[PDB]
C-alpha cells in the first residue's frame, strides 16, 4: 500500500487543531520529514524526526504550534489563516528509499 | 665474553624488532591493526549512512565519495521505483546514533584513501625509518556538476597511518551512525535500521585498542633505537642500556600480544566471516588480515620462545650494578 496522509478535519475552525494522520507507514524507517507546501524542500521543513534518537528537531517553517508523533502524524494547534493549504511528508526508509505524500487542510474564520 | 654473548641477542632481536617487517612482531602487530580497519570500513564501510545536516535542513549539501570501482553519495536517497533524489539524509540534522556529517565522512574517506593507498602501493615502512613518501588520490563530486580530486603527499610510517586509522575508528565509536539496510551479509540483515555502535560495538573496541597499542609499540620501538650497547663508567652505562632495551623487547611483546587477542574480539562477532576474505568488493576486508594474523603468531611465538635470553640478560645486568 502507498503512503496516503489524511486531515481530521479537512476544513478547521480558526483557533483550533488538526491532525494529519499518516496511513501505511513502513515499519523499518530512518525517519521522516513534513513541509509546507506540495514538495520536499528544505527551506520550507516545519519539522524532522529521527528514529534513531526518537528525536525532533524543527526546521524553518517551525512556528512551534506543531506536535510531531512517531506514527508521523502531525498536530497543529491554534491554527490561523496561514495555516491552510497543502503539507507534504517525506519518509526515509532504513534502506534509504524515500517516500512523499501531499496533505492539505482549509481554516476558515470564527 | 659471557655478556658480549647477550649483547648481541640483544641487538640482533632489537634489530629484527624495530627493523624488521616478516619477522618482527612489533610490524606485524602494527600492520594488522593498520589492516584490520582497513577490512573494517570494506566489510561496513558501504552500509554508513551519511548526509545528516549540520546547520539547517535548507542546505541541500550532497556530495559523491569516490572508491576506485564505486562511488557512494552523502545527503541524498532513492525515490520508490527509479531515480536518485537530492532530498535525502540531509533533510534529517546528524548526529550521535542517526547520521555523519558530510565533513565528518570526507574525514574518513580522506584516512581510508591514504591507510588503502600506502598499504597497497608502498607498504607499511619498517618501525625504524621514516617511511617513503607516496601521493593518495582523493577525489569526490557534487551537482548544481563539479569534480574534485586532491593529491596528498604522505608517508607510509607507522605513527601516520595510525593516525589514518584512528580518524576512522574515532568517528565511529564516537558517532555511530546508522547503517543501511536491505546478496547481504549477516549483520546486515541483522543491524541495519540500527546503530552501528550496536551491531559493531565490540568491533570498534578492539579496533580502537589495537591502534592505541600499536601507537604505543612504536614509541617504545623509537626508544628502544636510542639504547644500542672497559672500565666501571663502561660496564654501567652499556648495561643500563641492556636493562632498558630488554625492558622495552618485552613491553613490544606484551603490546604485540594484546594486538593479537583484540583482533580475535574484532574477527569474532558479526565479521568472523567477511573480513578476511574477498571478492565490487564491499561486504568484505580484502586487505590480508589473515595473512599478517599468522606472521604476528610464528614471530611473537619466536619472541616469547627466546624469552631465556632477556631472563637471563637482565640479570647480568643487574649483576654489574
Ligand atoms: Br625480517
Ligand atoms: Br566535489
Ligand atoms: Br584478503
Not at chain 2, 582497513?38 to 545528516?52: D, E, K, R, T
Not at chain 2, 562511488?71 to 521505483?81: P, R
Amino acid at each position: 500500500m502507498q503512503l496516503t496522509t489524511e486531515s481530521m478535519p479537512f476544513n478547521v475552525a480558526e483557533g483550533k487543531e488538526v491532525l494529519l494522520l499518516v496511513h501505511n507507514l513502513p515499519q523499518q524507517l530512518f525517519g521522516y520529514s513534513w513541509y509546507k507546501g506540495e514538495r520536499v524542500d528544505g527551506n520550507r521543513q516545519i519539522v524532522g524526526y529521527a528514529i534513531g534518537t526518537q528525536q525532533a528537531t524543527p526546521g524553518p517553517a517551525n512556528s512551534g504550534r506543531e506536535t510531531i508523533y512517531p506514527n508521523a502524524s502531525l498536530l497543529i494547534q491554534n491554527v490561523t489563516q496561514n495555516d491552510t493549504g497543502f503539507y507534504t511528508l517525506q519518509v526515509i526508509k532504513s534502506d534509504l528509499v524515500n517516500e512523499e505524500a501531499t496533505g492539505q487542510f482549509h481554516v476558515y474564520p470564527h | 665474553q659471557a655478556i658480549n654473548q647477550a649483547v648481541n641477542n640483544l641487538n640482533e632481536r632489537a634489530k629484527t624488532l624495530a627493523g624488521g617487517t616478516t619477522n618482527s612482531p612489533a610490524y606485524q602487530a602494527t600492520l594488522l591493526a593498520l589492516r584490520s580497519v582497513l577490512g573494517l570500513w570494506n566489510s561496513m564501510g558501504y552500509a554508513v549512512i551519511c548526509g545528516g545536516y549540520t546547520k539547517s535542513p535548507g542546505e541541500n549539501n550532497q556530495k559523491d565519495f569516490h572508491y576506485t570501482g564505486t562511488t557512494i553519495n552523502c545527503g541524498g536517497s532513492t525515490n520508490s521505483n527509479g531515480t536518485h533524489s537530492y532530498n535525502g539524509t540531509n533533510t534529517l540534522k546528524a548526529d550521535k546514533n542517526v547520521s555523519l556529517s558530510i565533513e565528518q565522512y570526507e574525514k574518513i574517506h580522506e584516512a581510508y584513501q591514504i591507510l588503502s593507498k600506502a598499504l597497497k602501493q608502498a607498504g607499511l615502512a619498517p618501525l625504524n625509518s621514516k617511511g617513503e613518501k607516496l601521493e593518495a588520490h582523493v577525489t569526490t563530486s557534487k551537482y548544481q556538476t563539479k569534480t574534485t580530486t586532491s593529491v596528498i603527499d604522505t608517508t607510509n610510517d607507522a605513527q601516520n597511518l595510525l593516525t589514518q586509522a584512528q580518524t576512522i575508528v574515532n568517528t565511529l565509536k564516537d558517532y555511530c551512525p546508522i547503517l543501511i539496510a536491505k546478496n547481504t551479509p549477516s549483520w546486515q540483515t541483522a543491524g541495519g535500521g540500527k546503530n552501528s555502535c550496536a551491531t559493531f560495538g565490540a568491533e570498534f573496541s578492539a579496533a580502537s585498542d589495537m591502534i592505541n597499542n600499536a601507537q604505543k609499540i612504536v614509541q617504545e620501538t623509537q626508544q628502544l633505537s636510542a639504547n644500542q650497547p672497559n672500565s666501571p663508567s663502561s660496564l654501567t652505562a652499556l648495561a643500563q642500556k641492556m636493562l632498558k632495551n630488554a625492558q622495552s623487547q618485552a613491553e613490544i611483546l606484551k603490546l604485540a600480544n594484546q594486538v593479537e587477542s583484540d583482533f580475535n574480539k574484532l574477527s569474532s562477532g558479526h565479521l568472523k566471516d567477511y573480513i578476511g576474505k574477498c571478492d565490487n568488493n564491499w561486504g568484505n576486508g580484502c586487505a590480508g588480515v589473515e595473512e599478517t594474523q599468522s606472521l604476528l603468531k610464528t614471530s611473537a611465538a619466536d619472541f616469547n620462545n627466546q624469552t631465556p635470553q632477556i631472563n637471563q640478560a637482565q640479570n647480568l645486568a643487574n649483576t654489574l650494578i
